Amino acid sequence: CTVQVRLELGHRAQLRKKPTTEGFTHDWMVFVRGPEQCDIQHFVEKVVFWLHDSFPKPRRVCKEPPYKVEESGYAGFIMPIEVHFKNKEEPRKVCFTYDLFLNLEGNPPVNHLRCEKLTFNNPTTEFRYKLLRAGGVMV
């Protein structure tokens, strides 16, 4: 059997009224979540967000919801995001390369969503139940 689950990755960015002491222009927030009335914590062990090289402790881990990072910056960057599963077999995780882009001065805030369907072929019984408890569907 095959079980499909959905993830939503997203981000919001806007200009700060007042730049930080480093002079960062923007606040941003990146997240991983499930669709409404779904609970991805049943099958997700943790989410790791890899911030820009410039950050202190760039490896940011969320072991429970909300799976989100909120920071300030001057520029967008490519953000590796790892979603680790409560699985004993492969795949143990999925990796996304997320386009964290900011609004150019003048332009309204950014509020984006990237929807990902995961297809698990022949998951173990134990993991199958986690996917289905999260609101996954047999296909």
Side-chain angles (χ1 to χ4, degrees):
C1 80
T2 292
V3 179
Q4 295 188 316
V5 289
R6 286 180 286 143
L7 294 181
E8 301 178 356
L9 288 74
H11 83 285
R12 312 201 228 284
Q14 60 191 327
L15 268 301
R16 295 180 58 88
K17 285 170 180 193
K18 178 60 176 190
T20 63
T21 74
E22 307 88 349
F24 298 143
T25 47
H26 287 76
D27 296 327
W28 56 252
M29 189 263 296
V30 176
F31 65 85
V32 175
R33 71 185 188 190
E36 296 269 296
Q37 314 195 334
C38 292
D39 184 1
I40 64 168
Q41 176 182 18
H42 285 302
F43 74 90
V44 171
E45 172 186 276
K46 69 189 168 193
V47 181
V48 186
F49 305 85
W50 289 100
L51 275 37
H52 198 266
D53 310 347
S54 66
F55 280 93
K57 276 159 267 274
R59 187 188 185 261
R60 298 299 182 76
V61 185
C62 297
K63 293 190 187 190
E64 45 208 63
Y67 314 100
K68 76 172 188 186
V69 174
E70 302 179 278
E71 288 297 332
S72 296
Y74 59 83
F77 57 96
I78 298 305
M79 178 182 293
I81 300 177
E82 310 166 0
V83 180
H84 294 254
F85 308 130
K86 294 167 165 182
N87 198 354
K88 297 310 293 136
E89 89 187 8
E90 293 193 343
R92 309 287 317 274
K93 66 200 169 93
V94 59
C95 304
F96 300 109
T97 68
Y98 194 77
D99 186 0
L100 162 48
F101 66 87
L102 304 190
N103 50 316
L104 203 53
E105 198 210 40
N107 290 333
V110 170
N111 191 0
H112 279 250
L113 203 71
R114 167 181 169 175
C115 303
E116 294 293 336
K117 199 162 288 209
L118 305 177
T119 302
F120 288 93
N121 297 311
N122 302 313
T124 66
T125 306
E126 184 174 338
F127 190 57
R128 176 160 36 252
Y129 291 178
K130 297 185 163 74
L131 297 165
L132 290 184
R133 261 193 266 126
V137 306
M138 291 183 313
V139 299

